[PDB]
Design an enzyme around this catalytic site. Structure first.
Site, PDB file in Angstrom:
ATOM      1  N   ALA A 157       0.835  -1.204   0.000  1.00 24.02           N
ATOM      2  CA  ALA A 157       0.000   0.000   0.000  1.00 24.02           C
ATOM      3  C   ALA A 157       0.862   1.243   0.000  1.00 24.02           C
ATOM      4  CB  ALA A 157      -0.955   0.002   1.194  1.00 24.02           C
ATOM      5  N   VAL A 193       1.924   5.307   0.580  1.00 19.80           N
ATOM      6  CA  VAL A 193       1.904   6.527   1.371  1.00 19.80           C
ATOM      7  C   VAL A 193       1.181   7.672   0.643  1.00 19.80           C
ATOM      8  CG1 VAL A 193       4.052   5.935   2.581  1.00 19.80           C
ATOM      9  CG2 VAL A 193       4.123   7.409   0.502  1.00 19.80           C
ATOM     10  N   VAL A 223       5.708  -1.004   1.821  1.00 17.30           N
ATOM     11  CA  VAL A 223       5.227   0.365   1.679  1.00 17.30           C
ATOM     12  C   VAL A 223       5.642   0.984   0.333  1.00 17.30           C
ATOM     13  CG1 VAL A 223       5.272   2.664   2.703  1.00 17.30           C
ATOM     14  CG2 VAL A 223       5.294   0.624   4.158  1.00 17.30           C
ATOM     15  N   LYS A 224       4.659   1.421  -0.437  1.00 14.24           N
ATOM     16  CA  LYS A 224       4.915   2.064  -1.728  1.00 14.24           C
ATOM     17  C   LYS A 224       5.119   3.564  -1.562  1.00 14.24           C
ATOM     18  CE  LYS A 224       2.468   0.442  -5.122  1.00 14.24           C
ATOM     19  NZ  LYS A 224       1.362   0.147  -6.069  1.00 14.24           N
ATOM     20  N   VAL A 225       6.268   4.027  -2.067  1.00 14.79           N
ATOM     21  CA  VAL A 225       6.688   5.380  -1.968  1.00 14.79           C
ATOM     22  C   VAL A 225       6.899   5.893  -3.374  1.00 14.79           C
ATOM     23  CG1 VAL A 225       8.478   6.927  -1.174  1.00 14.79           C
ATOM     24  CG2 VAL A 225       7.912   4.843   0.167  1.00 14.79           C
TER      25      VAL A 225
END
EC number: 4.1.2.-
Lengths: 220, 220, 220, 220, 220, 220, 220, 220, 220
Positions: free
Chosen positions: H58, H60, H84-86
């Site tokens: 998912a 940020v 975490v997708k940045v």
């Protein structure tokens, strides 16, 4: 990569040996003859000009295999670890086999075709020396011969090395190196061209001007 | 790389064996027939002409797998370490499997197609011999068949070797070697061409003349 | 496309002329020497062997440009419309220029390099004849020389034609034709291999079998 | 294709003009200076050495566009139809435009880059002369620059011709010609290599020897 | 090939105009802003900077087709033959159609994609301006977009011209011209680099040095 | 290049026909069905919404050739110059041949392979519509199919045109255009993406920003 | 390389098993059906006809994963080490995963696309069987599908093997082998063609004639 | 190869997870938005839809490095092992470095260029997610970008994985896999097309039909 | 991969070191001169600006090998672990050999040709830095040089690293990375363009808008 100069000019060799990372010097009969000093004079001189290190090469002159083997023995008496150049002819091939049996390292020279060069390697030659510019001059492609030879040694005699020779321009040498040649020998003019460039000189001059402009001197 | 001559000319083998780095001699039924000497004569003569060393090849004549295997046994009784050439036909393939079980090494010959060749290697042949010039002469591309066969062996039968055969010009041989052929067999005319070059002769003469002009002799 | 045979064998030329769509016959000094008949006998005989039609080629022998011009007039006095072959050497290039000015059609022969060949066309030659198999034998690439040369004529001498010569296998001739050669001369052995195929004969036999089988004969 | 010699050697031009199909002679400041004869002496000598035909080229020395135009006029007063060589610098480009407006034909010289070359043609230059070996010597690709330049002229200034210059080996000249150069100028050593080959001499000798040996004659 | 400078620097345009064979000057809203003068001042000044000749380009600022057309009319009232640059957006395309109906020539600008550019030409744009460097900077390939665009126009809108723009290095410009761009506009820094080379200057200097050595001066 | 919209959305066609340079509108059964209006309602309305000028295409529904010719007549009675789409099936090919004899223009559609597509052109169709995305979706290459088909028409049916259809992304359309498709029909989503780019919108905004920083206004 | 026959012809398998080096026999529902023998009869007959060793393949008939799993168990109960062919549909994929958990080896069959085939390997299939000639017959490229699939397995499922299937000509099999397929299954006609060549037969005949000519017999 | 679904449709994930070999599910802010359930509801449901296995992603939402790190901790507080997708922006890069120091795995997303992708891997990201279709739709090549990126990671960040995303058609997915992507995430439409083929269904139906004809039933 | 900034801008290095994963900073005489602080001030500052970590490069000014070695010792007394840049001239090559013997790591800089680069590595330089953009600007190909250089290091000096330098656009940097350079130094403007993309900002913006539209805020 073993970098050689193709010369009998002792003075030039000592001067260039501080500049280039040299593995040694190669000679052939015309190069020896042009320098006018006999083999048993020039070879030790060239050996000294590199501080007694590095590898020398010199070429047999006899026409029969037995004569060539005797030439080889003479040459080794002059420089104990020299590599003996044998032209890749019928008798030269025979001599390369006999020299392999004697533990005397050879290079198969006067190579104008890839198969020919390969045959020298199969007979025992540690180095094979295609004549790049000669092949170019005579309507072939020196680069293609080299490329092909290199492929042949890599597949068929992987301990043998190409020693690319006969150059009129830096581009030829570059292309030999790009083809994977493990060794190369440069005449003096081409070697000097390979390290002297107007664009490089302009870049250095510019650093000097910028450095002057900001610090009032060109020194660090 | 194993280099062979494709001949039944005993004297010629004696002379060329000192020049070329030969792994041996290959024969076939036509080549034996042309020599007029029977197998149980010419084969030992060929073996002795290479100084009692090297590898020989000779071909079965029978039509059935059973006959081919008996042919193999006879050939082995003539030369104990001979490699038996079997034409890659249906019966030939069966023969190759049978001979594999017996530990008699074989070569799959008369190969005009890559898949055909591969089948002989999968059945047990240590060598596979495409007929390069016959494929070229008959409107194909011998070099492409050799390239394809080599790819196939390398992927699917990596211990089998291509022994390229059937040559009219050195360029064919060169191209087989560039395609990665582990072995090759040359008729005498092409082998001679491959070590004789006017440009090489001229280079060697120029060396001779330059050495003469500098030192007053042509010896080292 | 102009299809030639490379021969002085009158009988073979007559028999083959009813099979091949020939444009004529090429000769050269060795081909003529082999046949033992002098030119003023062989040439009219060859001319006759093609029913009075077609084009012939024969080569000058002299060493000087003047000599070669005189050779050409003599050839022209034997066969009035003959094309004169001139070796592409320095003197030959001079002869070609002179012959162009005299309106005598020339072929630049003994071509082992592209640029060499292009020079003969720029000097006036109507045909340029690379020796494909000789270039191949001597460790070059006959086909690349033909390609390069044909590209050079198309760009820089578009009315000059390549006449590909020197063949050991049909594959060389095929590749020369694929490269766009406008003319070609085939030795008799290669020419006959070009029209004899086991697969073709098998196809024709199969047709005969199937016809027999349905109709009780092999005829229409 | 227009073939030039790159030389101020009047005796060599006369001798070679009967061999090669020459369009003319090119000179440049270094070539003129090595000959030591001034322009008002050599240029008419070169013109005469070609029987008063063909085309000549010579180069301006001034550093300003205005000076370059004045140098053009000096050159035209020595040889009324000479082509004027202008180095492709900022001032050179400006001068090529001025010369174009006066109807004086120009050649944009000292070209080390393709775009540079193109600009000269767009400015009015009839020929563009890339320095092939100079670019090769200095770590570029002279052939790639010629290829690119030729492409650019063909697309963007289709009436401008490449005049390829600066050669150490025939292979360079060959590659320039294969790239489609409409003109080329050869130094004498490269020109001589281009028509002299050991393999060709061997072919011609064999014919001679076979000829006498059928016919005891050294001609036809 | 039409050569433009991409600039609002009047003094520079005047100076460079005697050097380069300019077709004109392009502007855009950022280039106008950076020069600080409004359009009704700079355009006439740039026109006079080229001796009242050549072509000028300037960009509309409106957001709607209607507004863009009125921007066009205001531009034409300043320079009667100016080419109107319209960003290739949905409204830009609508505007290009309207302007085509009025006979006002356009250029489709701010092109980041080949299909985008093509649509502008199909709508009537006479020139299409891909932003080469911006494409490069944003993780694409300016040269491929240019190449694709040129193919599309040549196949589908052959009278439309590419005007390559947005350059940080001569290489990008070279590549665009190699791709066949019929026009190009260079910022001043790239243009200057395109005619100034250390290696060219070194070649001129050597000419001067040899001329000095032989004639005692550096002039003709 | 003929640019079509692939839609029955009359309102969208009205709006987009002022932005894009449309040649007209294509429909198919699923596109008609999805808009819910019968053919006798939408087809007239689409004819008006592309401003009364351009091509329309619509597809037959019958399953036999005779039934397909009847559907063609019905469609023509709605729009007298309509192009009739016929799925390239066995019955479709038969129908295409009939309609050709009747002078009614056809498009061979539902094309999933190149030879299929060619057959429709050989039968008489003026357009061939490969379904690009569908070929992509089902594990093929839509672009290769289009490339092969375009080749085939060009060689074998040179008056026939490719009308590339079935798109999910602009890249697919771009590649179809690069392959030389004479025509293309876009669904609305892909068309809109082909003229909307964030990088383009950012270039424009940068221009408005720079403009107003220098001039205190946003207008020209 | 595993070589399979694609057949239920028990008698033919017995014959071909002594000629070819077979790894096994593959079947499918059309092949079984065409043989008329139910599975529990033919599969053991095929196991025998190979020599009692090797690998068998047979296909599930059910349409839900659960039923395909029960088909798997039935097949396994006929031949305990059989490899179960599952068509690569959604439910087949689900069945492949279950079968992987149960440790029953599978082949993903009816593959018409590379990604599809890949999914079957990522699900647990040990083998993946693209239908080469089906893909070719339906306007695709079976060879490209196999090449793509083999690449996908090599990068993403390296312990899975392509088992190339569906052949009408030897060339298809050759290209699959050249693409690196680890296994392949041939129909009997294509297998027979792969070892029967007019050119090979002609070569053997000539050996026989030459041997006869020299020795008066055709035996060794 | 890790295969992901790009979705927030819990029910569909549950159904599809028994068909495909899923590694997990990817989400992004739009896919979460479209499903309407907030992160603390969907993420646990998606997890459970895969029976409490596999990997979740998912993204940020914060706009500075510090805020992205806080978002990372919020996501990790919902699903302890979530990736975490940045987005790969300046601030995102800084965040990727911090998150590496905190031992939280990241994916560099919103990747439109190869170098940008690489920087995210060099900064610590385990996955890099180029938006294939967005690059295609905006006039780039999504596939060239993926190929370039995969090349970069393989050379320069070999522990990092490409996770190819953003698809409208199976072909894009196939080309990403052929370019060597270690992972990929498919939207449900593309995924479904990747397992459903008319040609495959027709083949399965033919097997059933043949079975029926031989055995009077369609089960085993 | 080692990522460097090419700058003496201390503030910028501190700020960019939280964004990029920097291996350090490179300087040269122009970059030092433009920042105006002497080496003994900027070098320590640059080192601190990276939190006392990473590698630095600085360049000798002297003209003789001996002067250059002395410059090396001065630079090492400012930064103990600094890498000394030595321009690759004849004297530079000699200095590089000496520094190698003294165990002081070097970088061969001002590299405009591939062979020149290789020589610097053979002399012992750990890094070789071709001036990519200068080569591009001066009519060469920076990328081809980098590519050729990298091939030479890989074959002939595999422990040496290319450190690519001199960039006006991210495309140059991309192509260097794709060629396999182990290290690279970026000027600040190019580095910034490498992480700022309008397409990326629009993707992020869109995610925020969809998030807002579903949840009424833009945060998690």
């Amino acid at each position: 990569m073993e970098l050689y100069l193709d010369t009998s000019d002792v003075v030039a060799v000592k001067a260039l040996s501080r500049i280039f990372p040299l593995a040694g010097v190669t000679t052939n009969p015309s190069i020896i003859a042009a320098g006018k000093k006999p083999l048993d004079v020039v070879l030790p001189q060239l050996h000294e000009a590199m501080g007694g290190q590095g590898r020398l090469f010199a070429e047999v002159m006899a026409t029969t295999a037995e004569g060539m083997v005797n030439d080889a023995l003479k040459l080794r008496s002059i420089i104990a670890d020299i590599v003996v150049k044998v032209p890749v002819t019928a008798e030269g091939l025979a001599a390369i086999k006999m020299l392999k049996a004697e533990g005397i390292p050879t290079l198969g020279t006067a190579v104008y075709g890839a198969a020919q060069g390969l045959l020298s390697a199969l007979a025992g030659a540690e180095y094979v020396a295609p004549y790049v510019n000669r092949i170019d001059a005579q309507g072939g492609s020196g680069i293609q011969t080299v490329t092909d030879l290199h492929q042949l040694l890599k597949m068929h005699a992987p301990q043998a090395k190409v020693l690319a020779a006969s150059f009129k321009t830096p581009r030829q040498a570059l292309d030999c190196l790009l083809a994977g040649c493990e060794s190369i020998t440069l005449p003096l003019d081409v070697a000097q061209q390979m390290i002297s460039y107007p664009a490089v000189d302009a870049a250095v001059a510019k650093f000097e001007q910028d450095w002057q402009g900001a610090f009032g001197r060109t020194s660090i």
